[PDB]
């Protein structure tokens, strides 16, 4: 049950949170360190409660949200696995299902250094499930998709594989025995006992993954840094529309009808024969991999769409649905772009006005968008891709709008000009995002490494039996220094109150804060700044003023782009340019998507320094509706989480760089708002010990000292740190 | 606010026990603040004929204070100390200052064991300006290879003092952990202030201790702990051969004055540029100079003078421990077996064998200056056999 | 190798007698001489501010660039050569068009003064050291292809073309952006300026010794801050063993040193009797006897007046007070004797001590025939001619005088022995052909 040695008197701190959560069916939220080993902890207990069948069932389904610590998840739990083999004698049988099918899909040379994910599995899906469906035999067109036809025969068949595999494992295993990691997948989500994949792959309202059979029993998954949920949640069911889209749409409108003309009969009577069986009994086409190019369901929620075949009977006719609806929603759309309006189900209405038939129409139209397509089976995705976006959307609009947001911006960003109109439908209630999950779920554990408030479980609106918080001893001698500025000699105004553009008097002694932290520390800093054009307001005066003549000179910078490309470059510098004779400190930004998948070691990253209140700043009018939701929730919450938001994301960024527990983190905190909003935002157990023993206004200048003071003291003497070894009682 | 808060700091320190007996549990408490690591010894196997290298980084970190006024006046002024302590724990070895300055590394004194040198040396390296960067690939570099040339009967251990600024130098010194693991060359650093990671997996990865300068007490200690011929790394060696014994000359000896000074270019020995009259005699040469208990460069091998070198550490090693105890057997007239006095701070030291009763200027005066108790003897000599 | 005895005029006296002497020729002078230092003595040259320059220079190079309109040419590296040591292609066209299509002088600033600022398009110089590394980044894109782990690209991937979106989050940018298009351009130019100087070390780390591994991402990566690793382990009883030994040694043969064993037994034979006790009978009765005597001091009182036992005490002090006849000024023809062999003759014997070193150290190892190598059996051969045969004069112009001669003659020899020991003992181990 792998105590393994002293494990920072931890495990026992959340072995009844186990028994409490699970034997008792908890919900359950878990406070937890950055410095605990997220799984090390957690599964540790959890795969103790695999084989605990403590009446019969217990799933698992695990998630989190970077491929790469999906497998770092994976990477020491074979240890752990191989650990009570030896000790419980003989090895059962496992399976935990990396189930990647984004970017690790083919082994074909022709398909796979395509850059992209989506487009390239079209071209996978339309060689497999649309040309190798519709021209069945064949020789040369048909093309070489062989080892899903080996599916095909182990599909018939019953192997058993071994363990955990990862999405390379199976790549070998293409060339030689493991298949498809979408089909060597498929056969063992049949038999799966431990699934972990993306958080946001679960949830996709747009696609519904549905990732097992729908089985409420005892259906158990676990979570981890579940932080931002609704800016995944929102997000997901975030709908964008592009006046370039829709004209390309308007282009492969009539380029669709010359497909119409041109077949006659032949893929007519196809439809003819199957059209009648769709008025006879309603059954969907295929059961394959053509359902992953297919909206599997837009609004999940619902009960059935029982009435198919909508006012709509004919496919031109349909496809005058469309020439009804696209037509009328650029109608809808060019005369809307000198007002950014916000009226979810009045827009509805109004199209009730312009649109002949609605609301069965509109909920029934992305099927027979596909089926229609499906009878000729002929246009590739990427093609046809910016269309199932808009028989997407309008099926949205169909059914979750009066809870839901309409949002219409076609003002500037990014555009100077009105050269580029959008608009948004955002859900809002992320709630009925997770009121299916947990429909479909027994109850299932949040644990957020950041999360101090609880008070933001009810943001996700629900219910909690299990809320506590999670307090660990610290007997190495000092977890870490939390230091909050507030410079009095260069006056702190660390938040942007005259703004990141508004005045560089601000800026003037962010260097001197910054070089005096570069001189001090070293061995590498990752810290973070708000946003791009504020990293490039950043490094604005830092050129043409006189400021990197010593930073350049002290350590090295690393420059994190705004093309994810060049910002994968740094990395694979700082990675190095640490473990050199070299300190190298790295520059990010704190709510762009650099700050994650990382889990910082005493190797290199080991500080973080906090610039500004890390909030939003950006997005307009995304708020209020959101805003007045939440006061239609609580009433008294702009004050509120419009602090915590900011603070969500701090320490999901900041409390990053300890993983065990030794591992040092110097994570300052250069913060003009403090006073309350910091404190709230920290840890019960971070804020206890640490924060503000009686160092609040801390001067850099003075607060130079302190690090020597912390870092000195703390390289030397280790050897005990809080030691366990037989169990003493000690009742916390 | 902070008025105050400057004050709530003060305020309370000040205060203590009151009425009567104040400001006394203020210095009980400094004399308990007192007391720090003894000495955690008792090893075995290696640690003989050092051939130590002297690694100073000279930065802009010397710059800052922190100690001293300049941090080279906190390492420069004992390591004179350090060369003098060392001469006399452990004449059998030889140290290479080599000084880094300005992104290159300069041998400044060659590997050799004459104090003088060494020491006017550090007295020449008082004024220096310390420019530039630090470079310890150029530093390794004169370390490999001079000993590369040195036998592998030779123990190779390098002293780095690191200022724990960034390792400025190129040429994957990370690879030369290969190079030098290898070359059975043992490396320890000692960070100013801080530490390098790099420089501390390069230690760990050496088998060469590292460590972070705490206090000017605290760097004593370091040194003290690396006085100690250490136990490096296992298959070094066994032997080293031909260990020449001299002779002291008198120059008196048959024909009394028939040479005016024996060193006239043509003598065996004379070896410096310097006069003289004759008080030396190595074997292998027959070479006549100045007396030096190390070696020479034409016989080529060690000038071993016994009483001195090969009785240094010949009880450096075969110690053992006393004990403390704060009981009251009285044993002399409440006396003590050595000093022969008595004050009772409770700390009655008795030995391990002979059981005798020391103070602690009794402990020290052994455990620092008499290195083991004289109570064995009388003890361990009269049944010896 | 004629620099090294110019620049040194020390080595060049050392040199000039086996030229003026004709002892040995400079092919044995580069023989047999120098042969570690070239090593050594040639690390000076070579380094210059850490060759393989990566990671030493590239922090100090942008705040050192620029003093002045002139302000160049310090020494060797001053403050302009290593910025060609790191671009590779860029020093490729130096020496191309320099002074080749400029004047040289002209090229220092020039071609540094637009590029320096923002943006340098006025002529092809500085517009394809610009154009170049537009494409020296799109090099640098293929490298990190080839590592590909630990790097999000892989991961943010996934999550935006699965619903055509993150491309309004890329368009989404407050706080003006309608009418500037000054600092959008400069920045991101800035950006890929020191982006080039923080690649400038993965220009430079191809130098070092073409640094290559690129991560296979090594999947183990086992948190390891417990299981008390302990990376030293001595102490299996490897000097415990020693001292169970040599001190038996040092207890079955104490001190059988000149006069630290001879002496010692010798008397301890002369206590006789001793395990008879008979002598310790008498002892112990004499313990017993004079036991007594000491505490009265009677007889104590006057064991001090023997005046006879005055004389002579008083006679070996005054034998000792006075030594003489033994030549008291010893010195005042040593000053001729000291300049004159200290003129040549110092750094004469030096041309043998470091040679005759070696001549010990191929007999040192000879007999084992291993170091025999055609190399150093006939330099056993060479020098010893090369040597006994250039004192002989300087033996010979000493001789000029006969006791003037015959002192210090009688301490030279050893250098003819010493010579002529290791020839006769070259036979002594007799060698076949
Ligand atoms: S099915 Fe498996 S192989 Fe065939 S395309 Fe998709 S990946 Fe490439
Ligand atoms: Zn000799
Ligand atoms: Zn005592
Ligand atoms: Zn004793």
């Given amino acids: 049950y792998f105590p393994y040695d002293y494990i920072y008197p931890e495990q026992f701190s959340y072995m009844r949170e186990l028994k409490r959560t699970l034997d008792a069916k908890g919900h359950g939220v878990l406070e937890m360190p950055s410095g605990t080993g997220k799984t090390v902890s957690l599964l540790a207990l959890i795969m103790a409660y695999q084989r605990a ?93 062989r080892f899903y036809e080996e599916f095909d025969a182990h599909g018939r068949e019953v192997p058993l594989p071994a363990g955990i595999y990862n999405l390379d494992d199976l790549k070998a295993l293409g060339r030689r025995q493991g298949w498809c990691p979408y089909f060597l997948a498929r056969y063992s989500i049949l038999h799966a006992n431990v699934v972990v994949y993306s958080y946001h792959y679960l949830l996709d309202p747009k696609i519904a993954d549905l990732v097992s059979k729908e089985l409420a029993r005892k259906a158990v998954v676990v979570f981890d840094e579940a932080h931002n949920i609704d800016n995944v949640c929102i997000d997901s069911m975030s709908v964008n529309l592009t006046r370039r ?207 101090s408030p609880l008070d933001i ?23 870490l220094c939390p230091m909050i500025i507030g410079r009095g000699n260069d006056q702190v105004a660390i938040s942007s109150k005259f703004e990141t553009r508004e005045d560089i008097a601000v800026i003037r002694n962010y260097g001197n ?103 939003v700043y950006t997005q307009s009018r995304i708020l209020k509706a959101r805003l007045e939701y939440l006061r239609d929730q609580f009433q008294i919450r702009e004050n509120d989480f419009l602090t915590f938001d900011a603070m969500r994301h701090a320490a999901q960024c900041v409390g990053r760089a300890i993983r065990g527990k030794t591992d040092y983190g110097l994570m300052v905190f250069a913060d003009k708002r403090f006073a309350r909003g910091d404190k709230r935002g920290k840890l019960p157990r971070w804020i206890q010990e640490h924060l503000t023993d009686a160092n609040l206004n801390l001067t850099v200048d003075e607060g130079v000292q302190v690090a020597k003071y912390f870092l000195r003291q703390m390289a030397q003497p280790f050897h005990r740190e809080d030691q366990l070894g037989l169990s003493l009682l000690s009742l916390e | 606010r902070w008025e105050g808060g400057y004050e709530r700091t003060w305020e309370i320190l000040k205060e203590d026990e009151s009425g009567s007996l104040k400001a006394t549990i203020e210095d009980i408490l400094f004399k308990a603040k007192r007391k720090r690591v003894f000495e955690h010894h008792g090893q075995v196997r290696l640690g003989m004929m050092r ?148 420089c501390t997996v390069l230690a760990r990865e050496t088998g060469g201790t590292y460590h972070v300068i705490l206090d000017e007490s605290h760097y004593k200690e370091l040194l003290t702990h690396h006085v100690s011929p250490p136990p490096a790394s296992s298959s070094s060696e066994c032997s080293l051969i031909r260990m020449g014994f001299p002779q002291h000359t008198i120059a008196s000896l048959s024909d009394q004055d028939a040479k005016p000074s024996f060193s006239m270019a043509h003598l065996d020995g004379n070896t410096e540029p310097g006069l003289t009259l004759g008080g030396y005699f190595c074997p292998q040469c027959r070479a006549k100079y100045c007396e030096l208990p190390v070696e020479c460069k034409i016989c ?39 000093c022969q006095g008595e004050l009772k701070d409770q700390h009655v030291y008795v030995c391990a064998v002979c059981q005798n009763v020391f103070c602690v200027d009794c402990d020290v005066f052994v455990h620092d200056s008499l290195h083991c108790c004289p109570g064995c003897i009388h003890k361990i000599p009269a049944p010896s056999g | 190798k004629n620099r090294m005895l110019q620049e040194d005029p020390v080595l060049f006296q050392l040199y000039k007698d086996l030229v003026v002497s004709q002892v040995i020729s400079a092919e044995e002078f580069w023989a047999n001489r120098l042969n570690v230092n070239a090593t050594d003595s040639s690390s000076t040259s070579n380094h210059k501010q850490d060759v393989g320059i990566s990671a030493a220079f590239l922090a100090d190079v942008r705040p050192q660039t620029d003093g002045c309109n002139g302000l160049r040419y310090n020494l060797t590296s001053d ?32 071609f540094f003064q637009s590029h320096y600022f923002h943006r340098d398009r006025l002529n092809t110089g500085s517009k394809d050291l610009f154009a170049e590394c537009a494409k020296i980044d799109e090099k640098g894109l293929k490298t990190m292809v080839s590592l590909g782990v630990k790097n999000p690209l892989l991961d943010l991937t996934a999550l935006e073309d699965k619903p055509l979106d993150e491309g309004y989050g890329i368009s989404s940018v407050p706080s003006a952006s309608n009418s500037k298009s000054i600092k959008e351009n400069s920045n991101a130019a800035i950006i890929k300026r020191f982006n080039h100087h923080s690649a400038m070390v993965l220009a430079a780390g ?146 043998y001590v470091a040679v005759g070193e070696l001549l010990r150290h191929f007999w040192s190892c000879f007999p084992v025939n291993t170091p025999f190598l055609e190399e150093k059996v006939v330099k056993m051969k060479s020098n010893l001619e090369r040597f006994q045969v250039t004192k002989l004069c300087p033996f010979q112009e000493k001789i000029r005088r006969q006791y003037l001669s015959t002192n210090l003659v009688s301490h030279i020899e050893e250098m003819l022995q010493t010579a002529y020991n290791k020839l006769h003992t070259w036979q002594s181990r007799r060698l076949m052909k």
């Avoid at chain 1, 487009?119 to 497999?128: I, P, Q, R, Y």
């Avoid at chain 1, 909690?464 to 977890?479: G, N």
């Avoid at chain 2, 390792?167 to 202030?193: E, F, H, M, Q, W």
């Avoid at chain 2, 071993?304 to 002399?332: C, K, M």
Wanted: aromatic share 8%.
């Fill in chain 1, 457 to 479: 479980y009810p943001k996700i609106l629900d219910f909690h039996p299990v809320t506590m918080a999670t307090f660990t001893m610290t007997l190495a001698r000092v977890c």
């Fill in chain 3, 206 to 351: 191809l130098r070092k010794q073409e640094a290559q591994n690129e991560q296979t991402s090594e999947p183990s990566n086992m948190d390891g801050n417990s299981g008390d690793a302990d990376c030293f382990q001595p102490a299996v009883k490897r000097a415990k063993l020693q001292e169970s030994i040599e001190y038996e040694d040092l207890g079955k043969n104490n001190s059988v040193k000149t006069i630290a064993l001879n002496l010692k037994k010798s008397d301890r034979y002369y206590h006789g009797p001793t395990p008879i006790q008979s002598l310790q009978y008498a002892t112990s009765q004499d313990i017993i006897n004079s036991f007594q005597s000491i505490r009265q001091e009677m007889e104590a009182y006057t064991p001090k007046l023997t005046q006879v036992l005055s004389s002579s005490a008083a006679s070996s002090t005054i034998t000792a007070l006075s030594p003489g006849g033994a030549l008291m000024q010893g010195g005042t023809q040593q000053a001729i004797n000291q300049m004159v062999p200290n003129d040549i003759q110092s750094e004469l014997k030096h041309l």
């Fill in chain 2, 51 to 198: 051939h130590l290298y002297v690694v100073v980084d000279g930065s802009r970190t010397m710059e800052d204070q922190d100690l001293k006024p300049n941090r080279l006046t906190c390492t420069l002024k004992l390591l004179e100390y350090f060369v003098e302590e060392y001469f006399d724990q452990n004449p059998i070895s030889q140290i290479g200052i080599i000084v880094t300055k300005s992104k290159r590394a300069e041998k400044l004194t060659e590997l050799s064991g004459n104090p003088r040198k060494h020491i006017t040396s550090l007295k020449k390296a008082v004024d220096m300006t310390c420019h530039g960067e630090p470079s310890l690939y150029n530093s390794l570099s004169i370390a490999m290879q001079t000993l590369k040339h040195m036998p592998g009967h030779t123990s190779r251990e390098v002293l780095i003092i690191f200022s724990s600024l960034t390792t400025c130098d190129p040429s994957n010194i990370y690879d030369l952990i290969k190079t030098l693991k290898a070359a059975k060359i043992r490396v320890s650093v000692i960070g100013l202030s801080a530490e390098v990671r790099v």
């Fill in chain 1, 513 to 615: 804060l910054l070089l005096e932290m570069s001189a001090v520390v070293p061995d590498g800093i990752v810290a973070f700044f708000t946003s791009y054009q504020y990293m490039e307001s950043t490094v604005a005066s830092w050129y043409e003023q006189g400021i990197l003549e010593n930073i350049q000179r002290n350590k090295l910078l690393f420059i994190e782009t705004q093309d994810g490309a060049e910002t994968s470059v740094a990395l694979e510098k700082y990675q190095e340019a640490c473990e050199n004779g070299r300190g190298a400190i790295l520059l990010s930004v704190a709510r762009g998507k650099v700050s994650e998948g990382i889990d910082f070691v005493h190797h290199y990253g080991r500080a973080v320094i906090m610039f500004g209140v890390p909030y």
């Fill in chain 1, 245 to 451: 889209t829709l004209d390309r749409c308007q282009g492969n409108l009539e380029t669709l009808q010359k497909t119409v003309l041109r077949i006659k009969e032949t893929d007519e009577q196809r439809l003819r024969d199957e059209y009648r069986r769709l008025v006879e009994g309603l059954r969907e086409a295929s059961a394959a991999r053509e359902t992953d190019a297919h909206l599997a369901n837009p609004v999940l929620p619902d009960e059935v769409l029982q009435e198919a075949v909508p006012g709509s009977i004919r496919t031109a006719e349909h496809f005058l649905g469309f020439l009804r609806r696209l037509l009328e929603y650029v109608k809808w759309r060019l005369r809307v772009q000198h007002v950014v309006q916000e009226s979810p189900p009045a827009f509805l209405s109004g199209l009730a006005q312009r649109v002949c038939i609605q609301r069965k129409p509109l909920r029934f139209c992305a099927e027979r968008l596909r089926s229609l397509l499906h009878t000729l089976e002929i246009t590739d995705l990427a093609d046809f891709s910016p269309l199932t976006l808009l028989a997407n959307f309008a099926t949205l609009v169909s059914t979750y709008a009066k809870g839901f947001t309409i949002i219409i911006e076609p003002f500037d960003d990014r555009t100077p000009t009105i050269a580029n109109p959008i608009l948004h439908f955002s859900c809002m209630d992320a709630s009925l995002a997770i009121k299916p999950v947990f429909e479909r779920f027994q109850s299932v554990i949040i644990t957020s490494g950041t999360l």
């Fill in chain 2, 300 to 338: 080529g091998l060690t000038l071993v003078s016994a009483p001195h070198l090969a009785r240094s550490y010949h009880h450096l090693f075969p110690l053992d421990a006393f004990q403390e105890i704060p009981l009251e057997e009285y044993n002399g007239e409440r006396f003590c077996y050595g």
């Fill in chain 3, 79 to 110: 403050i302009i050569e290593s910025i060609f040591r790191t671009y590779p292609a860029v020093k490729m066209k130096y020496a191309e068009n320099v002074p080749h299509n400029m004047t040289e002088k002209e090229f220092w600033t020039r």
């Fill in chain 1, 53 to 145: 069948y403590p009446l019969e069932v217990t799933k698992l389904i695990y998630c989190s949200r970077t491929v790469p610590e999906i497998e770092k998840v994976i990477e020491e739990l074979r240890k752990l696995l191989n650990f009570y083999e030896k000790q419980e004698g003989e090895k059962l049988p496992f399976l935990g299902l990396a189930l990647s099918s984004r970017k690790n899909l083919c082994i074909h040379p022709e398909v796979t250094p395509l850059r992209f994910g989506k487009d390239v599995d079209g071209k996978c899906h339309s060689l497999t499930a649309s040309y190798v469906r519709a021209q069945y035999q064949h020789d040369t067109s048909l093309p070489h998709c």
